[PDB]
Amino acid sequence: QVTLKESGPGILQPSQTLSLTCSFSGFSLSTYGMGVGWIRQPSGKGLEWLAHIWWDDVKRYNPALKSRLTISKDTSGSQVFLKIASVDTSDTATYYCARMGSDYDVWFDYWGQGTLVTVSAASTKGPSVFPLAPSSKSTSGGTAALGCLVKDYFPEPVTVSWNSGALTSGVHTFPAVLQSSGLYSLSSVVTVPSSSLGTQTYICNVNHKPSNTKVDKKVEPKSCHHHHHH
Amino acid sequence: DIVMSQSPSSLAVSVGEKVTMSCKSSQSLLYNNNQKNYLAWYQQKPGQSPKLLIYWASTRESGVPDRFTGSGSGTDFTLTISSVKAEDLAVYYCQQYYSYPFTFGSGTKLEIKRADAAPTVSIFPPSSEQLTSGGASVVCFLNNFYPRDINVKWKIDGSERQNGVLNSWTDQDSKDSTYSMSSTLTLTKDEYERHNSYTCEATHKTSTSPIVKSFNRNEC
Ligand code: NA
């Protein structure tokens, strides 16, 4: 009945201005009783209300940032914008937009998926994608594991799907780990019937938007030959 | 500002248990004139945005299961789950909207307990493509185990290796309450090529004998 979707720059440098946009459907800020707010959440932390705006153009801001924030709505009624001036590392967070669940009260009934913003002077780097090939060594009972290693990228996030979204059961995409190099890495592993390895193609679709890196990597089985072994 | 204090910080329960969690505000959220409490509760599942559960302290949002009940008045509020389901693992947040600035509690993390389950173990040598690029990562994948705390041991030529290992766990499964994890040993290509046997072993509180996978470099 309602959708909201945040978009942002993915990464920006300290001192720059962050510009975020919320695009929504199923309601309009042209209509009585509608308002949208922004709430952020640093990784592993809690929620902080930032700002909100109503159909009548009244705006409210968190005093902890008020000087640096500007919220506005589009004339179409279908988007809201947030600017944060002079960003520093404390502004790295997931940013959510959400509709208020009342015409006058500030709880939030529908939320977007969030957009991650990393404040960093470090360079953008796209990942290498390496196959994790199934073999006897990834097979237990009648199930085989196979995957992709998504290595050495910055900033987060990457997305991984399998067979363009055709394969979803048994998929485990691990959270990224930031390595000492300043680069992230993760693997995505799926478990499938071992009997399927010969007839079913498996492709991991990796997207790293900050570097415009899109890779579709076919993961081919690699059985091992055991020398001098019955 | 109004400070919202949530307790306990975390709890773990089996499917079916009742749970209660508390939210206490530093001032009353009860508006004298209309006798309403200006309090909402949200549920945030792993990897998702928060979802509204309750507003006005006790009014349930459409589509929220009636096993969730909010109660309380003034400063002391409670969210009760009458009988928890496996899908309820989440961080639960309260929020006051009585006065500007609007503030949230620090959350209660709800996790699910289940019977011990041993992992299945899979191992992946470095890909030829990674080797061509100049690196060597050996990946060990532990699937569908419980509890979360599992010990992974790496051996190179029969000797325990701890340096250079990175571990990552998935969030708890919303259906079977298990975990999975990856353990990745990263070496230089030359270092990788200096050794033959690679072993990943998982030890848990299910068994005393480890679940193992091992390969020999070249022996393929
Ligand atoms: Na019960």
Place of tokens 């709505």: A73
Measured in angstroms, the CA of B82 and the nearest CA of chain A are apart by: 23
Q: Are strands B10-14 and B108-113 parallel, antiparallel or unpaired?
A: parallel
Ligand 1 centroid to B81 CA: how many Å? 10
Kindly state the tokens that stand for A89: 């590392």
Measured in angstroms, the CA of A206 and the nearest CA of chain B are apart by: 16
Q: Are strands A108-111 and A3-7 parallel, antiparallel or unpaired?
A: unpaired
Assess if CATH 2.60.40.10 describes domain B1-114: yes
Paired strand residues for A135? none
Size (chain B), residues = 220
Alpha-carbon span B37 to B55, nearest angstrom: 9
Paired strand residues for A24? A4
Instruction: Identify the H or E element spanning B216.
Output: strand B211-216
Does the distance separating the beta carbons of B61 and A108 come in below 8 Å? no
Smallest CA-to-CA distance from A76 within A31, A32, A12, A16 is with A31
Same topology between domain A2-121 and domain A122-220 = yes
Smallest CA-to-CA distance from B180 within B154, B144, B206, B205 is with B144
Alpha-carbon span A141 to A193, nearest angstrom: 9
Alpha-carbon span B30 to B77, nearest angstrom: 11
Same topology between domain B1-114 and domain B115-213 = yes
CB A146 within 8 A of CB A193: no
CATH fold of the domain at B115-213: Immunoglobulin-like (2.60.40)
Kindly state the tokens that stand for A38: 């922004």
Ligand 1 centroid to B114 CA: how many Å? 15
Q: What's the half-sphere exposure (Cβ side, CA atoms, 13 Å) at B172?
A: 21
Alpha-carbon span B105 to A38, nearest angstrom: 17
Experimental method: X-ray
Does the distance separating the beta carbons of B215 and A149 come in below 8 Å? no
Please state whether B102 falls in left (phi above 0), alpha (psi between -120 and 50) or beta. beta
> Which ranges constitute the DSSP H helices of B117-157?
128-133
Nearest CA in chain B to A222: B220
Alpha-carbon span A71 to A52, nearest angstrom: 7
Alpha-carbon span B79 to B113, nearest angstrom: 20
Alpha-carbon span B47 to A92, nearest angstrom: 17
A82, A95, B38, B184 from B163: Cα distances, Å = 44, 36, 52, 11
Nearest CA in chain A to B108: A46
Residue spans of the domains in chain B: they are 1-114, 115-213
Residue A11 class from Cβ within 10 Å (0-12 exposed, 13-18 middle, 19+ buried)? buried
Number of neighbouring beta carbons within 10 Å of residue A153: 24
Kindly state the tokens that stand for B185: 């040993």
Alpha-carbon span A37 to B119, nearest angstrom: 43
Alpha-carbon span B86 to B174, nearest angstrom: 6
Does the distance separating the beta carbons of A138 and B103 come in below 8 Å? no
In three-state secondary structure terms, B190 is helix
CATH fold of the domain at A2-121: Immunoglobulin-like (2.60.40)
A54, B120, B172 from B180: Cα distances, Å = 44, 9, 8
A60, B106, B173 from B10: Cα distances, Å = 33, 11, 17
Smallest CA-to-CA distance from A6 within A81, A102, A100 is with A81
Alpha-carbon span B83 to B72, nearest angstrom: 19
What is the rounded (10 degree) CA torsion for A168, A169, A170, A172? 30
Number of neighbouring beta carbons within 10 Å of residue B13: 16
The angle formed by the CA atoms of residues B43, A94 and A49, to the nearest 5 degrees, is: 65
Ligand 1 centroid to A176 CA: how many Å? 37
Instruction: Identify the H or E element spanning B193.
Output: helix B189-193
CB A49 within 8 A of CB A61: no
The per-residue b/e assignment along A166-196, b for 16 or more CB within 10 angstroms, e otherwise, is ebeeebbbbbbeeeeeebbbbbbbbbbebee
Residue A228 class from Cβ within 10 Å (0-12 exposed, 13-18 middle, 19+ buried)? exposed
Alpha-carbon span A170 to A2, nearest angstrom: 30
Architecture of domain A122-220: Sandwich (2.60)
Smallest CA-to-CA distance from B41 within B28, B59, B27 is with B59
Residue spans of the domains in chain A: they are 2-121, 122-220
Which amino acid, one-letter code, is at A148?
A: C
Ligand 1 centroid to B17 CA: how many Å? 5
Alpha-carbon span B79 to B72, nearest angstrom: 9
Q: Give me the DSSP letters along chain A.
A: --EEEEE--SEE-TTSPEEEEEEEES--TTSTT-EEEEEEE-TTS--EEEEEEETT--EEE-TTTGGGEEEEE-TTSSEEEEEE-S--GGG-EEEEEEEESSSS---EEEE---EEEEE--SPPBPPEEEEE---GGGEETTEEEEEEEEEEEBSS--EEEEGGGTB-TTEEEPPPEE-TTS-EEEEEEEEEEGGGTTT---EEEEEEGGGTEEEEEE--------TT--
